[PDB]
Design a protein around this ligand. Sequence first.
Ligand SMILES: [Zn+2]
Lengths: 311, 75
Amino acid sequence: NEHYFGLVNFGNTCYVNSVLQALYFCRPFRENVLAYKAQQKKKENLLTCLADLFHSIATQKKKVGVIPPKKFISRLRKENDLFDNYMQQDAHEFLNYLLNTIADILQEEKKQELTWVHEIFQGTLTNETRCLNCETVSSKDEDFLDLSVDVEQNTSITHCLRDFSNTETLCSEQKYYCETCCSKQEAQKRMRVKKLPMILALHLKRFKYMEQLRRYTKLSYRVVFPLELRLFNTSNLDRMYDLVAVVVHCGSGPNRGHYITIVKSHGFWLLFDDDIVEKIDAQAIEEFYGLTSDISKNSESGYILFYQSRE
Amino acid sequence: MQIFVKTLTGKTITLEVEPSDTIENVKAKIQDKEGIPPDQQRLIFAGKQLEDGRTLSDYNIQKESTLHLVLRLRG
Ligand SMILES: [Zn+2]
């Protein structure tokens, strides 16, 4: 009963398309979106347009084709001055904008607590800062819809995610203002995952700022993404996740490029490049890890990873 | 009050700020430490990208909050 349809590009809109495809293949998200369509009112907003689009995909007569998200793109440009243009944009900025926009619509409707957007994507970190002078530990919980992880050459996302939560020692210019010591002190700072989300969206920080050159470059490093991940909670002790989609940035630099998405569907992989959909072998996904050598060249690099919890 | 920014390499920096600081003001302070122009900076906190024209107290950003600094790959 599945339907594989590309999306028309309406003027540098691949950044939107690629995210829409990833989200379509996040099952709990697609299901909540379709349930929204099933009950929805006549008032148009970004969520009703997204729901109409998902419904259109889900109900095509044929199993393969192309859909124009014309109404969704018009509405996107109307609502968000940031995207009200025909320029190339960042997929992650678009992802977070879209999710929070939907969430705000859902919250407003509850008021005539958590929305289903948060049920799906929200986790919680516990930041602990420990003054090394008095040993006082201060804990602060902070939610997220995705984690932006830093990268390095020839590593795995498992390592990137672990480094995110590793203990950092703060010295010299980064000393911590301790309220017991009433002064800046050396400290240890650690961000642990208190609660893992149903879908874990990981954003790779594939960029580096060169102070002297006054610009930044894209990091086209090899960063391996496994098909499954076991993740742990601080206080279920752990959760297994499976990779369901990768938004991929194609380009040698950060100012221009194109976006495509690879998704898992019924045990095989599909590549969605705007209007084109192709089957790809499990092995060809390795191309999206990034470049081994000649790393300032054109790369097709994984940028946003979507991991779906098994339960 | 002192907040934290998790920078592009994962290194954490401190910023001295007030609740009435705008997001623009915060970006200028990051620029003073990291050299990145404000118009290239995106800051994420509590699952939301912070908007220019708003203040730290609009987002209920208190002491010890960690902002997440990211840039862009345009496509
Ligand atoms: Zn202390």
